[PDB]
Amino acid sequence: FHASQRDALNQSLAEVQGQINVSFEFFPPRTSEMEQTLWNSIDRLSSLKPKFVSVTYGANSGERDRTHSIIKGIKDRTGLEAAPHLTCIDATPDELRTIARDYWNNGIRHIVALRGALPPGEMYASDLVTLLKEVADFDISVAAYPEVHPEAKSAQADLLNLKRKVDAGANRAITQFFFDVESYLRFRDRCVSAGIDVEIIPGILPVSNFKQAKKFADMTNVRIPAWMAQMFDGLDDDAETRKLVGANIAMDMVKILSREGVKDFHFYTLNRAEMSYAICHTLGVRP
Numbered sequence: 531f532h533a534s535q536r537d538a539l540n541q542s543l544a545e546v547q548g549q550i551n552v553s554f555e556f557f558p559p560r561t562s563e564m565e566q567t568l569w570n571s572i573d574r575l576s577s578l579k580p581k582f583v584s585v586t587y588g589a590n591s592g593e594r595d596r597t598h599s600i601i602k603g604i605k606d607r608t609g610l611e612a613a614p615h616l617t618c619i620d621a622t623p624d625e626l627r628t629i630a631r632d633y634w635n636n637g638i639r640h641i642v643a644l645r646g647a648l649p650p651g652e653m654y655a656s657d658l659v660t661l662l663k664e665v666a667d668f669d670i671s672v673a674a675y676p677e678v679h680p681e682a683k684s685a686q687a688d689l690l691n692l693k694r695k696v697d698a699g700a701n702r703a704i705t706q707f708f709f710d711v712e713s714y715l716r717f718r719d720r721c722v723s724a725g726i727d728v729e730i731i732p733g734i735l736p737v738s739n740f741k742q743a744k745k746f747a748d749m750t751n752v753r754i755p756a757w758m759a760q761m762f763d764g765l766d767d768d769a770e771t772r773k774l775v776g777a778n779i780a781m782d783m784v785k786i787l788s789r790e791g792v793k794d795f796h797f798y799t800l801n802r803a804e805m806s807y808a809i810c811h812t813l814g815v816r817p
């Protein structure tokens with residue numbers, strides 16, 4: 531019954547070996563240990579020839595000189611297309627055009643146009659897109675929220691907002707991470723209903739640390755399924771078991787998403803290379 535479904539999935543994944551593009555998202559390191567972590571991770575995950583790698587920004591962090599440096603260090607160490615995150619926070623339309631020409635002339639030809647987090651304590655991503663695509667013919671990725679962005683009036687608005695960002699001239703939508711695949715599949719079908727013509731690249735978060743993931747999820751309004759709480763229940767001190775239980779969950783998801791057509795994945799690495807590399811191994815992405 532459910533045994534032929536498993537053998538078909540596993541075999542049809544083994545067959546999709548070489549047809550899959552992967553991206554890794556890093557964040558700028560705070561500590562000296564985390565700096566070394568990042569650079570090993572970039573060393574490991576480079577040998578997978580990812581189509582690109584992104585570096586998070588962080589609203590009013592002031593370490594855009596942390597981001598810009600990393601984007602350089604990546605571009606020099608590895609020669610991979612590094613794609614920085616750019617927000618509309620503590621920044622005037624005047625400044626951003628400069629940032630854009632600073633980037634474009636250093637070789638940075640791909641930017642992830644987000645708005646950035648700074649709620650009551652202005653200029654929207656659609657604008658920042660339109661802004662960027664008249665500074666130059668950039669590669670632009672935008673965020674998509676399969677479970678609806680937390681501040682969106684409703685799903686319909688949020689979807690229409692993504693249309694707007696693509697209409698403005700975004701190539702790719704990279705989703706928030708999600709634990710219900712059904713969520714994502716439905717969302718991708720709405721996009722095409724509502725005439726959004728871009729790849730809805732799923733964001734995969736390999737979960738080794740559930741306490742941290744449970745945190746990230748409440749903030750971004752991302753449902754943690756029943757099964758998944760019970761699954762991690764009891765592994766609080768047990769990091770080896772958490773790592774296998776998490777790799778399994780990611781590996782199961784990317785196997786199902788792969789069967790469903792998805793030929794592009796984006797890994798929220800958290801600057802840690804093993805889980806991602808292993809999952810990529812299962813997708814036939816290998817040195």
Ligand SMILES: Cc1cc2nc3c(=O)[nH]c(=O)nc-3n(C[C@H](O)[C@H](O)[C@H](O)COP(=O)(O)OP(=O)(O)OC[C@H]3O[C@@H](n4cnc5c(N)ncnc54)[C@H](O)[C@@H]3O)c2cc1C
Nearest residue numbers: 586587588589615644645646655673679681682704705706
């Ligand atoms: C792939 C990815 C990468 C990320 N990287 C970073 C990062 O590097 N740094 C960081 O700080 N955060 C990052 N985030 C988090 C994200 O930037 C925040 O959650 C932010 O609040 C949303 O930005 P946005 O690009 O979705 O903005 P938008 O697409 O503009 O949407 C933001 C909100 O505004 C609403 N909205 C849109 N248009 C209007 C309008 N005309 N009037 C009123 N409301 C409107 C939307 O519905 C939504 O609720 C990332 C998220 C993802 C999925």
